Write a protein that binds this ligand. Structure first.
Ligand SMILES: COc1ccc2c(c1)N(CCC/C=C/c1cccc3c1N[C@H](C)CC(=O)N3)CCC2
Length: 119
């Protein structure tokens, strides 16, 4: 039977970096997401009462550039984890919530065709 494809880091990078660059270019919308959450500096000391698995753009980038991803779905799941964290922690009337809803719309649009074309 057909086995699960493991990818060359170089192919994963060359196929998925663009969808990540599309998020990063949105400014200010990507600013909330660029850097691991510091609950002290951001003045949100209850952050980890609500979020339990942190994730950010800088973490996804390093994972991609040091080939820690073997399958493209691991990348996709990490992006959605970062967005689901934001939707869960922040109010619907907040900028981080609204920035999240907007970077999600961009991502769905970049990523859905890329995944058609990968094994
Ligand atoms: C307390 O905010 C600050 C203070 C100084 C400056 C801030 C924000 N901006 C944006 C930084 C990114 C915000 C990050 C952020 C700030 C408040 C709440 C959330 C944030 N995001 C991550 C995703 C955590 C989250 O869910 N909700 C840069 C200029 C200096």
């Amino acid at each position: 039977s057909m086995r699960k494809k493991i990818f060359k880091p170089e192919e994963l990078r060359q196929a998925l970096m663009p969808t990540l660059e599309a998020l990063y270019r949105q400014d200010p919308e990507s600013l909330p997401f660029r850097q691991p959450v510091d609950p002290q500096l951001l003045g949100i000391p209850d952050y980890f009462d609500i979020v339990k698995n942190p994730m950010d753009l800088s973490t996804i980038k390093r994972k991609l550039d040091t080939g820690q991803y073997q399958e493209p779905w691991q990348y996709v799941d990490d992006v959605w984890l970062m967005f689901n964290n934001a939707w869960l922690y922040n109010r619907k009337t907040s900028r981080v919530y609204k920035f999240c809803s907007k970077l999600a719309e961009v991502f769905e649009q970049e990523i859905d065709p890329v995944m058609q074309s990968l094994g």
